[model samples]
Target: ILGITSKKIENFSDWYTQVIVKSELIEYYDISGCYILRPAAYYIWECVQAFFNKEIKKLNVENSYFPLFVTKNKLEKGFSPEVAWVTKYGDSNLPEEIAIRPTSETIMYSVFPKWIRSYRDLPLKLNQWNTVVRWEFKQPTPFIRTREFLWQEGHTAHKNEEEAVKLVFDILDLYRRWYEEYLAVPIIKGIKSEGEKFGGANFTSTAEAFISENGRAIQAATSHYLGTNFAKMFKIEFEDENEVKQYVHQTSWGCTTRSIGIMIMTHGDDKGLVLPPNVSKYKVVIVPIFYTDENAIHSYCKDIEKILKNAQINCVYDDRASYSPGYKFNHWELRGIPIRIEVGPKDLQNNSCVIVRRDNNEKCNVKKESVLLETQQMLVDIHKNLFLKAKKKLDDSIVQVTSFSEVMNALNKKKMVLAPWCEAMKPLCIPLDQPPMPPNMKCFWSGKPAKRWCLFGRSY
Candidate 1:
């Protein structure tokens, strides 16, 4: 009953549902397209938050909170169609139908100008950890497609286009590192095709990952360069040193809970979750294997737990009674604890313990004196191995095409396509790499002179 019922390869959708729900990572609610993030899922969010907050602080970005409700005038500015409104206050109609924020540009811009009077206020970088609601009708998939979800949106104002553009890439690099390092998910750094770019942005950069199992490419995070577009609309301006007036250039970047889903789909297998060591809440779990000596095994496991804890590993001693060793193993494996330590009667006599890596399901026995060093090394190696495995899969899934039909054929066959583009056609991952283009190159679809190489794939 506690196990995942669906095979990940046979029914990915059902398999994902069972893993998230049965592992206590997600709890379904009465509302459709909305689910509660339980401890297992929220812990990942918090880990991400801490890392993001610490890194952004080093970049001089300050965290701030803004209002959730936006006025009609501001709400009309952008991201409008699916915006949810509060029309009534319990029994009576409200003065104005306030819109719940689908995004924070209008809400923050309406007030951010108050803090900017001159050039000194330039480069005002602010970030917020909050939730937004977008009532998309498409079927929801927990953290990936939820109507309401959590995200961190970073907004910045600069004196000119150059600084604004620089900030966009800076944030994009942070996103790239966050995904590749912390999430242990391989991602491509790219620029969105014109049609795929945010409607009002001058340019949009993103971090993308491909799911070989589902044959879909997912955008993990994005950074947009407004370059005076929104500043001109919102009338956000500042005085220059010469006392001349100029509209400010702005940028916004976001990393969302959708990232959690990306990681889940990337490394998860038939067992359930195969969490990366960097983000796993309980990195190591200790289980005692007793036989004729409860105290010996229990005390040994407890001591092992102490060594791991002292080394700064998030360790837990599974002392739950009435549960078989296999049951405890399944429970923790389902939850994706990275390392499992088992000390039995034989191990106690030899003063050694078995270390099992959840990522690869490999087991080895290490002496008691080497528990801390071995575990610390295994955690490092697990993250490395998970990332390399996923990266290899993604790399092998990419195919280069010479024509439009070939691109479609590759997508049909569940492969990511790379081709020459003139920026005339829309959509597909256009890598920033912009692989060198020969003057003789022609667009895959348009037959026009191609400017650069771009990637094309079916995406989420």
Candidate 2:
């Protein structure tokens, strides 16, 4: 059966795998650490791509790509141990071992010095939609932990540190909104501890979300301020207006395919996925109910679909003759279509259709003339309700702690703890719009005088 056999609460991992498989979003690959993104999953990625491209270009960022290969020397730009696939020339033990890129910093910056020569070329922003290879040894978890995945990586350089700093937070905010508004997932913004911060970065800001099913926090995206580190290492220098040469300030940030997985974990149920309207490939699915009047039902559905499309709605009319109406309903539900409109002989006679919402399974009959507006309103409401519910859970799960024991206890209970950090604690990040931390508090983990609250939890 295509239906999920395990309860999400009792067996989340198995339940997620089942739902993803049944929904046709992914197919397991022969390799242990790789998976295929079927059309269902890629469509959501495409939507995200289109949204981000439009939004980023507003800031004068241009799309460009660098090579997929890097030299072994350039691969050492960051402190993190490198994960690369090395290749040797045929028949030779080795010439110079070439490495497939894990990230583009070293390879891209190698050309930055040539491209950025003067203050007039001060701010250079480029983003690439591409794939990166990491070759992980851990047990793969589909989109969450894979050897390779798709993402948009933006790299920028500025003549001064001010613009570089501004770019980091601006992009970080963009990522937060994308998660909260488009994906219907609520997240917390924070700085990573030294132990967790990206290697060779001056600081790393992240958008993190909690998954209730497993009581774990997952980092959704990260924006890094490289300061002068990479610039100096890679010799990315430019002449200032005063003819003084200086290393450029740099930033790199990215959001990955893991977002699809997070959305699944957050909103999916034992029944199947429940996509937010903004990212759903097909927002409305029309399923006609009929028995004897098959031809009439087919024509009616096709006509309604054409009308909806003209009204600027993304929809599909499911008039598969071989499948029963009940089967079509289940199929659409599994696919997470935001709205399902049903036309029956009785309803069509009255110029009406039944609209069912996937978010809550609420059904109501609406006049055909009003289907467009009603469908739009329902989608909006569904997105709002999903956001609020996820937000409430996040708020409820964040526990404030003052002691190491309390921090551990909170984790044991599957709750995220907010504690004052000392001993050079890595605060995940301070949200740009949030109020300042209270003046006095002790560190939860180190018990030293603390300056601000930091979130701590077991993470994926």
Candidate 3:
């Protein structure tokens, strides 16, 4: 139904490539292991950064910067060397072989001791917005598991469990809200199985959401409760009110660019990229249409542009005389602009504007006086519609497999199976393409000995 080379159902991979490349979300960089995030993708990232920065600030989580290179000695101190060191470029004058940082926990917590001292500073919450290099063996996807990606990591040290848990849960709540409200993706709130927990974290609570294509769950964001693990190793201690020195309990939480990747795969279709308006960088794009004699269309567009700007909506006017209305529509659809306001001669003559919604290819005609309010309302509706659409797919795909026969049936149909496990049971997820259930396995992750359901399926 669109300009895509292949249908989404017939060729998922080709469809994704078509949307990702044609939409101009990303482009391959000169470096073998990296890709440049073009405006279509980076603008959404910037919007997320701006929104998340404000959210964390409200909780007194101050943003800061840290080193990107990890020292060899420090890298080997308490981390897996294979995942840590990707230092391909270094000179003879470089000191002690620096490794690209896989994650910043080691280096950031190193200075935490110097940053914390008294009871007043017992709970020091800090966050950093930066990109890190983490080389992987898996095939590289733009924002999924590339050699480098951007994310915000929050590090906090607290006096006790009460404070530490509060911080972690608070971030979890914000992440859930961000996903459900802003990204229009519903997520399941749960703790990670022991094996899936982040390396070096004492324990982790994660929000797992899924893309409907494969019905596989993606770990959207994770909040780890450190429980003095990093504080003791990094020597971050503070004096308590009881006049006793104590190592502070800590927590680390993160949301990465991978979330956007999952979002695109979850919501985008054969038409092109579909974005929830809240996170869309350019909420609305005003395309000025002109035929052989359409000066009136141009004038109407200019007036609408002023109204949009005055209403504080971020917009871009596509007035290039070289491009036709048809070409602009295709280009912007590929670019995933959430809304397209087409003010052409016919639209101007009717005293209305045509609003093309990215989510469903639905269009609405609105009067000139209501353009401002209508734009705001449509943006919100797009997010809600995406969430409901995705949520319905998720609900339908979750199959309850209580027995071996049910499991076999569900797997064959490519559905997520929910089963039970004991507290000592092993990992719930595996890397295989097929259903990754263990041979004669009882269930997965749930502590109840009785049949408890754990969802498992394909992931990006």
Candidate 4:
């Protein structure tokens, strides 16, 4: 029997919190706005790191580390408007206040201008995987909203605006494809409203807007086009191909652990997490069940474990003496391992194993020798099934709008509305649009006069 099932329909927040904690993915830390990422949760993050690292590297992006502490004055250079600051430090009369680097842009570009003097260094692409802090005053949700979080921030400086814009969209496209193909989550791509743009960014591009089960819209991943704003501000000057000196055009994009939260909210069921096969740390979990002959079970499980290890599939064989099969079943299921394999004396005697799929809860028996091939096949099937399942969720949650009434209706329906807005008002959507829109919208607004439409939704 399942332990406890949160009523997803009756209570979204409570159910989410309960499922998250009960599944042992994370727990509240001593700090109010922080949570500890346990092994189970951290494994998922690790999988993301490995996958995304390869993806970015393939595009010639190099990963590096930077300082975590930022001088208040340096941070102020990158920080456009005064937001918040840490006033005090540990017992010492330091000459300057320090900030727990919320981001590395300011410090990074300070060195960028020094190293990047010629056209050869025109497209300097660098990314750093690190943790950042922002004093969290609002309610913090695990993996969603937090005071501190882990992510990869990519900063690239190019010789021209055209190159910068292309790289910005390039990263945005990569982020969208990553979410859709790997996470199996669907999203709408668009620019952010003025109020929603990053503090110093010229423009913000997003990959997701929710038409989720929850009425509120949520943002998934984003890329920001800073243009020459930060470059000129930080004096990141470079010599062009023609020996002309000019400010570098810049772009910054990032995907946070919040991607995991979006994955959960989009695909998880009351049974607990239902991770996509591409994102699962372990593709398969095997349990050799033995009711009567413990030694027989142990012997067979050992052999199977060796076989699995040789196959190079990330598999865990649970032969623990402490827990019953029922309990272990619930535990792994909650963790959302894609495949569960069970081998008992009966199946072992028949030279077979039982396979259970998580997506649809389907079970099948496979010949012992076929475990490797069959497991691989099932993982493919699982990925396809998960994508379809998430696609259905997206289909149900997103609403198309052609008018203000439709937009209002979308909000009432708790769905994200994709519509055409008056292009003039697009600046009000965010501050960086140089050609501003009118104060009041009389007709449908869009990106440009010739632009077709835009998407609007409440987002994270």
Candidate 5:
């Protein structure tokens, strides 16, 4: 057994905290709703940021920073630091109070009118990787429900409705791929019900995925079309080429550290975190397997390390003499390195080594000459297998129903209900690039004609 104190299936909350803390991903903070991201967790976050930064630059989105505090008047246009550093510093001496940002809409839009003057400055796209705070009444769960968390928020404005809508869905698709392709979590793309949509948005679209163990669907990321709501409120208007005055169409989208929690919940098991290769800081971990001739094995491991590095492989050579190979294996497994390579005297004599995949515990022996090719291919295979497994669980959990009673029954059975919903209960999104809904379908909640099949399930 690993160092974790609880079993994932028997005590999920306890299991999560144990895995996170023991594996060195995060540490508990003095504050109730906050946690510290250790080196391991921060490294993975950096990888994601690196990939996303390069991607958005292609779309002409520039990175920028804004102040953390907003004036009381602007905040009305928006966390409890009821006794925060600011409040304690003032000690009730200040004449007016300012609020820390819960989100950037109110603070960022204050200058949009000045920055935007005419149609030439029409399409403004800016993104920031920052932290936000929100006071929570419910018990917090590490990354999933923290009061303070890190995230990347993208804000954009366009002169026309067509461009704004296009930006919304395009970013939504990118978010879907981010979870599926990079995180190995399959996601469903859709619009939120009126009740579920963001408070300031006209319509909200999301990339949703589920954790089958808990029978809960979570929003991985969301892209909202704000229409002219924020624009009109802030007077973010620009003169069109036709000399006509019009408010700009606006959008805001974000993905947070909560994603790390989702990945952990979806793939982690009794052993510990099972990180996907793409997101894992090191693709392979090399543990020297030797009871004698430790230096001989060390020399061989160093050689293998050099070769792997030359081939552009991210690897770690665990050659600590204090711990046994078994201990190292368990430690790395808990940390979720994608592949483990064991080079022993016997294997060196045979010019081969043992390779074990973290995802399935599948093992294979390969000659040193073929190790490079095998490692590359195995990483690719591991990513595919993880994605397929999660995708199957998500696919199987969805149960299509035709009535409200059936929807309720399916939900009670720990399954997601996909049915034609009334206008009051809209589908998450009418998926993109799919055929139209059948005209004869009837609403599951009402006896009236159906609009389309919406996905319904308990959420986190």
Candidate 6:
């Protein structure tokens, strides 16, 4: 019942569904576009929250809660997607229809004017960890695309344009940090093409992570610099140096559970999920292999578990009699626990245990005396190895093409195409590389001069 039936590369969509379902992370809800996040999924989200919340605090940002319900009259002003409407109570018709928030921009901004008055109130930065409901139901994937999903929306206002722009990149760096440092997923940082940039923003900066298994590029997160546009709409005005009224420059940035989906796709394998060590709730799971000396093995495992607990290493000791060591291993692997320690009579008699990291599944024996140190080192190695393996895949999967035919050929061969473009079709990120086009360089399709190199591919 717990085993995966589909190979990841051959049948990716079904395999992704199977892994998320069988691993106990995502539970399908009664509603078509919604999914229930179980403890496993929430744990990773909390890790993201804890890490990001702390980092933002260092930049003088504070967390706040915003209203989830807003009205449509004001929403006709700006938006993100199909709004979920609540028009009735039981069998009675309500006085006015209420719309669940698609994004908290309008709700929050409508109230921002009262909080800002002058240059003294210039930099008011706030973030809310919340879920927004959109009415979209087309091929919903648990974390990737859902009706309602978890995310953190950060809003900030500044006196000058440049200051707000700085925070945008600062926040973007943090998003990259979470993906690269915490999730161990390598990413491409660049400016979204004008057509692809967030609407109503001057420019959108994004972190793009690649899934080499399917030759796709997923936008991990975005930070946008809204220079006076939203402030003008919401009338978020502040007094300037001359005491004259001026619209505040603002920024809004967000990172979502879509990141979790990217992580699942980036490093996961056919064996099951291969969770990065850094964000995994329990970095190691101890499986006691017991035979006739059940009590002895159980006692030994408890002792080692105590040691791990005392040393502050996150671990779980599987002492349940209903399941075998093989069963426990399968369960933990499918659940994406980063490390597994097997304690049996042989290892217990030798005063040692065999430790295996989930990513490689390589067993290494270490004495009980240094088991704590070994586990810690293995966790570090697992994160490092997982990241490098994924970085290599992302690197190798991308091919540089100089012509339009190569772009089509690369697309056909199931690889990412890096092309020099003046923006013809839906180009991905225009890389952050230096841009001073030589007089000779031409566009991949237009034959007009190319401005910058771009990543082009299809994605979920």
Assess each prediction's global lDDT (C-alpha) against the native: 0.87, 0.85, 0.77, 0.76, 0.84, 0.86
TM-score of each: 0.97, 0.94, 0.89, 0.88, 0.95, 0.96
Residue range 285-386, candidate 6, lDDT tens digits: 999886657888878888988998888877899888888889998989998999899988889889999998888889989999998988888888888998
Extract clashing residue pairs from model 5: 75-78, 190-428, 190-429, 191-428, 191-429
Each model's number of backbone clashes? Answer: 0, 6, 5, 17, 5, 0
Cα deviation of 118, candidate 2, in Å: 1.5
Q: What's the alpha carbon RMSD for model 2?
A: 2.3
Q: What is the descending lDDT order?
A: 1, 6, 2, 5, 3, 4
lDDT of 4 by residue, 229-281 (tens): 98888888988788888888889999888888887777777788887877776
Number of clashing residue pairs, candidate 5:
5
lDDT of 6: 0.86
**Is candidate 1 or 4 superior in TM-score?**
1
Q: Name the 10 consecutive residues with the lowest summed lDDT in model 2.
A: 424-433
**Clashing residue pairs for model 3:** 23-334, 216-458, 419-452, 419-454, 420-452
What is the TM-score of candidate 1? 0.97
Write the residue-wise lDDT of candidate 2 on 1-460 in tens digits.
7677888999999999998989889999998878999998998899888888888898789999898888776776432443765665666655666787788887898888999999899799999999999877667798888888999999999988889988998888888888877889998887887878898899888899888778888899999999999899888998878989999999999999999999999998877989999988799999988755778888878888988899888899987778889999989899889899999998879888899999889999899788888988899999999999989988888787777788668877888877666641224444433445667666644657776667877778
How well is each residue in 1-460 modelled by candidate 3, as lDDT tens digits? 3477876777777788788778878888886668888877887788778888888899999998888887878766633533655445544455356887777888888888888887888678889888877666667777766778899899888889888988887898888887777777877766666767777677787777765554456778889998988877888889889889999999999999987887788788877888888777678898877664667777788888888888888888888988777889988887778899988777777899899898788988999999999999888888889999988886777676667678778767767766654441223432112344454556433323542335556664
lDDT of 2 at 185: 92
Cand. 6 TM to true fold: 0.96
Off by over 4 Å in 4: 78-90, 209-211, 424-450
